[PDB]
Design a binder for this molecule. Structure first.
Ligand SMILES: *[C@@H]1O[C@H](CO)[C@@H](O[C@@H]2O[C@H](CO)[C@@H](O[C@@H]3O[C@H](CO[C@H]4O[C@H](CO)[C@@H](O)[C@H](O[C@H]5O[C@H](CO)[C@@H](O)[C@H](O)[C@@H]5O[C@H]5O[C@H](CO)[C@@H](O)[C@H](O)[C@@H]5O)[C@@H]4O)[C@@H](O)[C@H](O[C@H]4O[C@H](CO)[C@@H](O)[C@H](O)[C@@H]4O[C@H]4O[C@H](CO)[C@@H](O)[C@H](O)[C@@H]4O)[C@@H]3O)[C@H](O)[C@H]2NC(C)=O)[C@H](O)[C@H]1NC(C)=O
Ligand code: XJQ
Ligand code: CA
Ligand code: CA
Ligand code: CL
Ligand code: NA
Ligand code: NA
Ligand code: ZN
Length: 805
């Protein structure tokens, strides 16, 4: 109930919202149907429109008008945005040359440059270039400020997940808004774009920027707007708030536009009808900037122009139907469209089996346009699993396609020509970032970056301490002229042991054999030097990784590779080696095919054993440093040490062997040498974070050898590829992957073919940031480089995407 007979007189767009059943006058009252009776009359004036004209100049103030051209309007803070242009001979902001803003030029009483966030729904990254002729105000922001060629959204590339990620710095799995529609089984409640359930605070986790500001004594209302308030009135409201007295004035403001998304859905991303919405958004930016210029704030405010996601061509005819795959289609609930989420229609149905649904959806049709996954098997880069609102069964839908339950869903809802939601690495889903103001750099282009990083920067822009989030604070320091955040490297928690030769061969009873009993004072001292670290500067290029948790581990040196060997997990946490452009690939000699050799630096009690693998009929083993890349026949014996062995399903070993035998050498030829760090990952509870020992769900049968959920590799070389990886003077270049360690290759529909036709495609799908590997392993990489730490942070957040131009 609302007692709507209160009044908005003197309260229009009040910042504090009032409590039921008292009527409301804030920018959200329309959404709640709770505005006072006189809200439209008082607060949503439209008389005479949005622009001054010659005849209005110096008019007698008329309180009915939408905005004013009377002489008093500047002191009132309520002139039409074009007032000074029409009436006082001034120029539009867009017509002024840009001049570097070296320092904030702010009116007295301003304690800090305000931040204005201008969010545009569905603003695809390529609009910046393709629409530049019809967006002169945005083009000036972009060219004079700091811009990225594009910004990567989070998955799913839907509105609510992305806007709330912008506000919180968190992945959707952590903030809880994991789609535009959701079912929460604990609440037993549903969330929708339409309706009131979304108003309940229990859906919305983390700490959004307006709450972070408020808690720290910086004024800020929410970033939400009722859809029916026109854009011109939103801008005028922001400009009025900026005229408040110092003690009442917010320091952060948000404008939201439903366009160009609204039209993009109807017309496709590049439909001829799309020009007008782009012109209209530009006009709104022009209004704001002209309004700031009138207030003398245009060289004081930091403005962020940012999108939530892009838009792709999608039509009704490109829909796959689950009813073409499944017999039991009525026993499932599907969340449909550009991603699929499946759960049982009834929790009382005990004949429901996820295993049978997945199999019925796996590689069934030659050109199938979606792939089913258990959520824990989704690429780790999506960070889309650790939330009860994310259904166990997920369908990744190909760009340009929809998935639906049955045909009648699609014609009893062709309307639409655009949609979004797909994998956040898809080119059409990328969106925009431009920062303009005293705190941003001048005419500066920065590399693409992820939207999860912006919360930290917005906090820096406002002098706030960010709540805990998924950005990597410092990785965007290069966007900023000042207010950089100067982080320190995390402290190593566990220091390594450096074992010498401590065990005789006969102390081992591992059930392994090797044909290595074939026997030189010259070369004898040499191999001792190698075991003591003599080649470590070659294979460990950026220092040893730091272990950021409590554990017991050993550093093991070898001619061709160095490793950090876990006495708790019985295998390396990491193995580092460098492969020059000139390296040669060789085979595993016949006599060494089943060779595993005890490591006399490491006790039998802390070693794997071969008998466990003999007995485990499902499980085989592979090596972290590949024997194929040994520097010499004698160095090759080091590759067969029991301390370089890791458990691998035979189906995985097809993937791993091709990576090690073919692809490492290919990258080293292409990149002029590579340094590789490889290792296991254990993430049995799919939270994106390193498992403790007591969280391991699977062991090699009969043993304490834990089975990894994934294997990673970090592949580093010189950004200037005229320099070899091992003698690089400048910035680095990296690509990484986190490959799922799976007992079948059902994910790769072409897996019956030669690895040359499917393995690299799998690895591209499972591309990762070094930071993702850091979270999953508790390791900290690149501790010793010649580079600034902020630059290293940017490198650790890099994702190699394998998308074209
Ligand atoms: C991305 O960044 C984020 C933010 O930094 C990272 O997420 C953090 O990860 C931490 C570790 O997983 C986690 O720390 C836990 O906090 C628990 C207290 O939780 C509440 O308070 C915080 C702080 O205000 C709040 O943010 C939480 O909000 C979550 O939950 C509500 C719903 O209740 C949601 O509205 C909200 O969206 C959010 O949900 C997400 O997180 C939860 C987990 O907290 C998930 O379950 C959801 O799926 C969703 O993703 C909470 O309201 C604290 O209780 C935990 O302590 C337990 O574990 C420790 C280990 O130190 C153990 O020693 C303790 O004994 C304790 O265990 C006890 O409870 C167990 C479970 O019942 C039981 O089994 C035991 O036997 C014990 O009794 C824990 O320290 C932190 O909450 C989140 N923060 C956020 C905002 O998500 C995230 O990891 C980053 N991602 C990556 C990939 O890096
Ligand atoms: O504004 C809109 C449409 N719209 C319109 N009216 C609404 C009315 C009420 C609410 N509630 C949400 C939960 N709220 C608690 C907050 C405070 C702490 O936790 C979240 C209470 C207010 C929402 C809306 C709403 O969304 N779309 C753009 C947009 C802009 C910014 C973001 Cl971050 C997002 Cl996700 C979307
Ligand atoms: Ca959107
Ligand atoms: Ca984990
Ligand atoms: Cl109303
Ligand atoms: Na076996
Ligand atoms: Na297959
Ligand atoms: Zn949309």
């Amino acid at each position: 109930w609302t007692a709507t007979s209160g009044s908005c007189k003197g309260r229009c767009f009040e910042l504090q919202e009032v409590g039921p059943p008292d009527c409301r006058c804030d920018n959200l009252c329309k959404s709640y149907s709770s505005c006072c009776h006189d809200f439209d009359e008082l607060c949503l004036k439209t008389a005479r429109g949005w622009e001054c004209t010659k005849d209005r100049c110096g008019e007698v103030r008329n309180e009915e008008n939408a905005c004013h051209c009377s002489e008093d309007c500047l002191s009132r803070g309520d002139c039409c945005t074009n007032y000074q242009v029409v009436c006082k001979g001034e120029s539009h902001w867009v017509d002024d040359d840009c001049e570097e803003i070296k320092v904030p030029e702010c009116p007295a009483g301003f304690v800090r440059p305000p931040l204005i966030i201008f969010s545009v729904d569905g603003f695809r990254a390529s609009y910046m270039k393709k629409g530049s002729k019809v967006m002169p105000n945005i083009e000036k922001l972009r060219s004079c400020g700091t811009h990225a060629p594009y910004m990567r959204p989070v998955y799913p590339t839907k509105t609510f997940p992305n806007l709330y990620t912008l506000a919180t710095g968190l992945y959707p799995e952590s903030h809880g808004i994991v789609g535009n529609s959701m079912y929460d089984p604990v609440f037993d409640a549903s969330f929708h774009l339409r309706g009131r359930e979304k108003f309940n605070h229990r859906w919305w986790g983390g700490q959004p920027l307006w709450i972070t500001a408020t808690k720290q004594g910086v004024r800020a209302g929410t970033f939400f707007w009722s859809v029916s308030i026109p854009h011109e009135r939103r801008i005028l409201t922001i400009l009025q708030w900026l005229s408040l007295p110092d003690n009442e004035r917010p320091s952060v403001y948000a404008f939201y536009s439903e366009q160009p998304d609204f039209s993009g859905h109807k017309y496709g991303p590049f439909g001829p009808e799309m020009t007008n919405p782009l012109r209209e958004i530009d006009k709104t930016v022009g209004q704001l900037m002209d309004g700031l210029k009138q207030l003398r704030l245009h060289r004081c405010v930091n403005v962020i122009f940012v999108g939530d996601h892009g838009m792709e061509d999608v039509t009704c005819d490109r829909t796959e139907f689950l009813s073409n795959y499944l017999t039991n289609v009525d026993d499932i609930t599907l969340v449909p469209g550009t991603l699929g989420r499946i759960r049982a229609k009834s929790i009382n149905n005990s004949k429901y089996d996820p295993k049978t649904i997945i199999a019925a959806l796996t590689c069934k049709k030659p050109d199938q346009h979606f792939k089913p996954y258990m959520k824990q098997h989704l690429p780790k880069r999506l960070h889309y699993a650790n939330n009860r609102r994310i259904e166990d069964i997920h369908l990744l839908v190909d760009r340009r396609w929809h998935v639906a339950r049955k045909p009648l869903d699609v014609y009893k809802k062709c309307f639409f020509q655009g949609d979004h939601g797909f994998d956040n690495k898809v080119n059409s889903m990328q969106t925009v970032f431009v920062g303009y103001g005293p705190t941003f750099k001048y005419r500066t282009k920065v590399p693409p970056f992820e939207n999860i990083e912006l919360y930290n920067v917005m906090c820096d822009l406002l002098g706030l301490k960010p709540a805990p989030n998924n950005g990597t604070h410092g990785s965007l320091n290069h966007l900023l002229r000042t207010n950089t955040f100067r982080p320190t490297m995390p402290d190593e928690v566990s220091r390594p042991n450096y074992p010498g030769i401590m065990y005789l061969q006969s102390e081992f009873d591992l059930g392994c054999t090797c044909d290595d009993k074939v026997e030189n004072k010259l070369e004898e001292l040499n191999k001792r030097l190698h075991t003591k670290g003599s080649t470590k500067e070659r294979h460990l290029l950026y220092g040893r990784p730091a272990v950021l948790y409590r554990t017991s581990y050993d550093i093991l040196y070898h001619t061709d590779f160095e490793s950090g060997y876990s006495e708790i997990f019985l295998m390396p946490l990491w193995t580092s080696y460098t492969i020059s452009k000139q390296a040669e690939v060789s085979s595993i000699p016949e006599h060494l095919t089943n060779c595993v050799r005890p490591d006399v630096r490491v006790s039998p009690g802390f070693s794997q054993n071969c008998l466990a693998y003999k007995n485990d009929k499902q499980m085989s083993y592979g090596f972290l440093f590949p024997p194929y890349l040994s520097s010499s026949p004698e160095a090759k014996y080091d590759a067969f040490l029991v301390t370089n062995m890791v458990p691998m399903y035979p189906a995985f070993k097809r993937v791993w062997a091709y990576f090690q035998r073919v692809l490492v050498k290919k990258y080293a030829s292409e990149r002029n040498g590579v340094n590789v760090i490889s290792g296991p990952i254990f993430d049995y509870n799919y939270d994106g974070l390193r498992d403790t020992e007591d969280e391991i769900k699977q062991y090699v049968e009969g043993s304490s050898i834990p089975v990894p959920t994934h294997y990673y590799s970090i592949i580093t070389s010189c950004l200037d590829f005229t320099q070899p990886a091992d003698k690089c003077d400048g910035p680095l270049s990296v690509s990484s992957f986190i490959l799922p360690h799976r007992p079948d290759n059902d994910e790769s529909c072409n897996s019956s073919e030669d690895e040359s036709k499917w393995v690299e495609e799998l690895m591209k799908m499972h591309t990762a940031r070094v930071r993702d590997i850091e979270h999953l392993t508790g390791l900290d990489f690149y501790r010793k480089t010649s580079r600034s730490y902020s630059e290293i942070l940017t490198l650790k957040t890099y994702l190699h995407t394998y998308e074209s131009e």
